[PDB]
Amino acid sequence: VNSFSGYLKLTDNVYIKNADIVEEAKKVKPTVVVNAANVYLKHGGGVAGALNKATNNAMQVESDDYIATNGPLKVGGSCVLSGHNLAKHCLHVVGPNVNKGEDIQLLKSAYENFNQHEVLLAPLLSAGIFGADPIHSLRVCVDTVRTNVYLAVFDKNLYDKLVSSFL
Numbered sequence: 001v002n003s004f005s006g007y008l009k010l011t012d013n014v015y016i017k018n019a020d021i022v023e024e025a026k027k028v029k030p031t032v033v034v035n036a037a038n039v040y041l042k043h044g045g046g047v048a049g050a051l052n053k054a055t056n057n058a059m060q061v062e063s064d065d066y067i068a069t070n071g072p073l074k075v076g077g078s079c080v081l082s083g084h085n086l087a088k089h090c091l092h093v094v095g096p097n098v099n100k101g102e103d104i105q106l107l108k109s110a111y112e113n114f115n116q117h118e119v120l121l122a123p124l125l126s127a128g129i130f131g132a133d134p135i136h137s138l139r140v141c142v143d144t145v146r147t148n149v150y151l152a153v154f155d156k157n158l159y160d161k162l163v164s165s166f167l
């Protein structure tokens with residue numbers, strides 16, 4: 001049993017809710033919250049900007065030190081950093097940015113990072129401002145992630161469409 005509430009079960013291991021991931025993280029304080037990161041860990045908008053803002057910019061400060069030491073992530077890659085006031089850990093995952101010619105096939109590689117964590121709170125990678133179709137992102141998630149994933153869909157209209165088109 002875990003403390004996530006009001007999710008619609010989609011499969012054995014995937015659950016979905018219309019939720020703002022920052023508000024959900026603040027309420028649940030999960031072990032792992034997933035950030036929709038870019039390779040530079042520059043947290044400006046969407047999930048990354050919102051999480052970073054909720055940490056009072058501490059996420060960005062930590063991230064800048066990480067990049068100065070390690071260099072950029074790979075598209076499809078990830079790193080584990082602090083969850084600050086929101087979660088124990090933040091898994092920063094880079095999905096391909098469709099609007100800049102990066103392969104959508106890398107979305108599967110991005111979701112594979114989730115399998116290193118038993119339970120996660122995550123948004124739909126590559127969707128929203130990253131330019132890919134959220135219906136596709138949900139399908140790749142379901143077909144790739146085997147650990148327990150609690151998906152936070154920001155928009156109610158989109159949430160309802162994702163549920164309706166699922167089977």
Ligand SMILES: O=C(N[C@H]1C=C[C@@H](C(=O)O)C1)c1ncnc2sccc12
Binds near residue numbers: 020022050128129134
């Ligand atoms: O930006 C987000 N998701 C994108 C992926 C699918 C779209 C959606 O979920 O409506 C948009 C996101 N998701 C969840 N909590 C938050 S809080 C700020 C942004 C955000």
